[model samples]
Target chain A: MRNYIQGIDHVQVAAPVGCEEEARAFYGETIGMEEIPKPEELKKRGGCWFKCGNQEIHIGVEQNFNPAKRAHPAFYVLKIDEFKQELIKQGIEVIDDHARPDVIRFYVSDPFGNRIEFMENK
Target chain B: MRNYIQGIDHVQVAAPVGCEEEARAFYGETIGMEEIPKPEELKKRGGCWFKCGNQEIHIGVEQNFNPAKRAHPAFYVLKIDEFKQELIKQGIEVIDDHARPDVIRFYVSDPFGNRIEFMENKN
Candidate 1:
C-alpha cells in the first residue's frame, strides 16, 4: 500500500504530575519555545503545550511514569552552537552525539527526565 | 524570547526486545510507511526506522520497556475512512477521539504498544 501519512502533527512527552512550571522554565524560557493554551478540559489534566514552529510539543501528566530515556523527539535548530551554550548556561548538561548520519547532535533531559535531542540545521 | 525550534525532525517510539518482524508487518506492511535502513552501528540495537512524509519515525528497542500509554506522536492523514477500515480488517482496534478541538482523530497502538494518533487532513 502507498503511504497515507503526511507528517507529524505533534509529539507528546510524558511528565510526572504537576510539572508545568518546571517544564516552562526549561522548554519555554531556556529553549525559546512559546507556551500555547491547551483547551479547557485538557487544562485540568496538568502539564503544558509549546508551539514548535508548525508542529507542537505537548507535555502530558502521567501517573507511575517512567522517563523515556531512549525514545525522544529531535528538533531542528538554526543557531545550534548558540542554543547549546544557552542551555549550558542554564546549568543543564548537553550530551553530544556525532554519530548521526548527516549532523552532529546533542541530547538533554527535560525537567521531567524525558530525553530530547537537538540537531544543527544544515 | 521566541521559538527557536523550527519543528520536530523525527519522533522516536520505543519497542520491546526482538520486535523487528512484527514492527515491519505493522509499521511497514499495514501502515504503509517505507522502512529505512538503520545505520550499521545502530542495526545491532534492534528495532527499525520508517520514513514518514517529511520526518522519520524511529522504533528503538528498550530493555525492561513499558509501553508509552499517554505520550505519543500524532500524524496527519488522508483517506482517513479507508485507512480506519483497513486497520479493522486487519484485526486492529482504533479508538476514536472527537474531543480534540478542530479535528476528530483516532488512536492506534503500535505492535510495541506505543500510542499513535491519526488525524484527518484538512484542506
Candidate 2:
C-alpha cells in the first residue's frame, strides 16, 4: 500500500433518468472520461466513468430527484487553461469568478443541470 | 507539515444574507462546528467554521447566489452513527442511503438549502 492516501479520487453526482445519457456525453465525450465499469449491483443503477487524471464522476439515477444549485463538485484540473477552453469550445457556459487557491475557476452545468466547478488548487 | 492530508478539511457552501444565521444555527449550533475565525480580509467576505474531526465548512456570500442541489460536499465523519443522531436530534433531516463507502451515510440541507453528505471512510 502507499505510505499516504491521496486527495479525493472520485465524486458522485445524482441524475434523473433522462439526464444519465447526457451526463455520459458531457463527462465522457465532451470532458473525455473513460467509462469505468461498476460492480454488478451498481452497474444497473448508474453509469461510472474515470477521467484522464485520478478523478472519477459517477451519475446515479434516483427515484426522487433534487439538483445542486450554485453548488458543485470541485475538480482539480492539471491543464486548467486548456480544459477551460475545451469546455467553452464545446459550448459549455463558464463562470469566471475570483476565488481562493489562486487559480482560474469556472462552473459548468452537467447533464442534470448540476454545476461542476473546475479549479486549479496550488 | 505532515506526511499528507488525510481527507477534506472542509467543503465550502455559499450562503445568502438571511440564510447565514440559519446556517450558523444548523452548522454551528445544531451541527456543532467550532466556529473557527477567519482572516481579516475573509471576515468581511463571509463566515467560516470548523467541526469535530478534520472537517471544515466555509460559507461565502455571493451577489449572484446559486444553491447546490441533491449534490453536496461529502465529509468523512469519524463518529458516523453518533453524529447522525446528533444531527437528527437537532432537527436536521437524515437520509438512509446505501453508498460506496462501507459505512453509514446521510444528507442534510444547510440553512442556505445546500445538501451535505456525511460519511465514514475506511481511511
Candidate 3:
C-alpha cells in the first residue's frame, strides 16, 4: 500500500439518452475499450463502463447532462499515426490544427459530439 | 529506445484570443502548472504551455474559437480529496456528481470555462 502510484483510474461523462448503446459499441468494439460491468447499485442509475489498461471510463445518462465546452479527454495514444489512420479507416472526421508538428495530435468528435483527442508523446 | 515507456506526455487546448492571459495566470499560478516557452516561429501564432509531471498542455488562441459542449480533459491527480480542497480554497466552483465514490473525482472550471477533472487511482 505504501508503494502506490497516484494517477487517473477512470473518467466519467454524461452519456445522455439513446447514446448509451452507441457508446458501448463504439467504446468497446471500435475504440478497443473493454466493458467493465457497472455495479448493481449503479445499474438502476444507468451507465456503461469502458476499460483502458488499468483505468475505467464511465458514461452515465443525465437528463440535463450536456457535452463539455472546449473540453474533452485526451487519450494517451503512443502510436498516434496508427490511431489516426484507424480512425480514418472507420470514417471519422478529425480536425488537424497543424499548430505544432513536433508532437502529433488531432481532434475527433464522438457520437455525442464531444471532441476527443488522440495524441502521442514525443 | 525499445525500453522506453509509452504514455500521454501532454495535452494541447485551443486558447482563443484575449483568454490567453487568464489561462496563463490560472493554469500556472493558481493551479500549480509551470509555463513552458513556446517555439519562436510558433510564438507569432500565439499560445502558451503548462507542465504537469512529464506531460505538457498547450493552449492556443483561435479567432473564431468557441468552448466545447461538454468535453473536457481529466488530469491524473492521485490526491483526489486534497486537490478538491485546494480548488475550493482558491474559490473555484466544482461540480460534484457523486456518481461513484470508489474512484473519487470532481470537475472544476478553468478561466476559459473548460471543465477539468482531478482524480486519483485506487492503487
Candidate 4:
C-alpha cells in the first residue's frame, strides 16, 4: 500500500441549485449508474452520488451554471456506436467529436450542461 | 471483457489558456505524479497529463477558465495528516476540514485556484 494517496474516491460534476431530479434522468436514465445514498450532513449539502465500478460519481450543486466543457469525466465503454444509439433512444443529445484518433468517442450534455464523454477503446 | 461501460478513463480538470508548465508543477511537482507526454493528437493540445493511481488526470486548457470550486476529485489517501503536513512543508496552503463524519480530510487548491480534496476514511 502506498503511504500517501490511493486512487480517486469520487468525482464531482456541478449543476445549478436543485438539480438532483433532472440529474437522475441523465446519469441514471441515460447512463445507467446506480445511485448511492448520501450521509445526513452530506445530504444537507445538496448533492447525490452514484456507483461507478468501485469508485463513485458525485453530482454537486453550484450556484452559477457554468460547466467545464473542455474538462470532463470520460467514461470507458465497450461498443461505441451501440451505446450512442442507446443514449439517442433515451433522448440524450450526443455531440460527435473526432479529436482523438485511437478511441471512438462522443460527447453528451447532461441535464445540467456538464460535458460528459462516453467512449470505447479502438 | 464486460462488453459494456467500464469506469472512468480520465477525469480532466481545467487550467487557464497556455497553462502547461504551471499545470506540470501542480500535478508533477506538488502532487508527485509523473507527467505523461501526450502522443501526437493530444500533443497538439496545450496541457499536461498525469497518472493518478490506476486512473489518468488530464489538466486541459480552458479559454474562459473559472475553477470548479464545488465540483472536485476526492482522492482517497493513506496517511492524510502526514500528507497535509508535507504539503505545508512545501509552502502550499492547505484547508483542513472535519465536515465529513468518518473521514479525516482537507481541501487544497492547485496553482490555478481549482479545489482538490484529499481524504482518509476513519469512520
Which candidate wins on DockQ?
A: 1
Query: Model 4 over residues A1-122: C-alpha lDDT tens digits?
Result: 12476677888888788888988877776688888898778888787788777678899887676876667788887788888888888677888887888788899888777888887768
Q: Recovered native contacts in candidate 4, as a fraction?
A: 0.73
Q: Candidate 2, what DockQ? A: 0.10
Please report the interface RMSD of model 4 to 1 decimal. 3.3
Write down the lDDT of every candidate, Cα atoms only: 0.85, 0.61, 0.66, 0.80
TM-score of each: 0.91, 0.65, 0.71, 0.92
Evaluation by lDDT, superior candidate among 1 and 2: 1
Docking outcome class, model 1? medium
* Docking model 2 quality class: incorrect
On lDDT, the candidate that comes out on top is 1
How does model 3 score on DockQ? 0.19
Ranking of all predicted structures according to TM-score, beginning with the best and ending with the worst: 4, 1, 3, 2
Per-residue lDDT of candidate 3, residues A46-96 (tens digit): 778777654556786778766643535567666767777776888878886
Taking the tens digit of each residue's C-alpha lDDT, what string does model 2 give over B1-123? 111112223345777755667766766677666667765655666656555443345676766776765555555566677777767776678877784544556777776667676666644
lDDT per residue (tens digit) for residues A7-63 in model 1: 888998888988989999988888989899998867788889999878899998888
Which scores greater on TM-score, model 3 or model 4? 4
- Among the numbered candidates, top TM-score falls to 4
Which candidate model has the greater DockQ, 2 or 3?
3
Each candidate's chain A: what TM-score? 0.93, 0.81, 0.85, 0.88
DockQ, per model, reads 0.69, 0.10, 0.19, 0.58
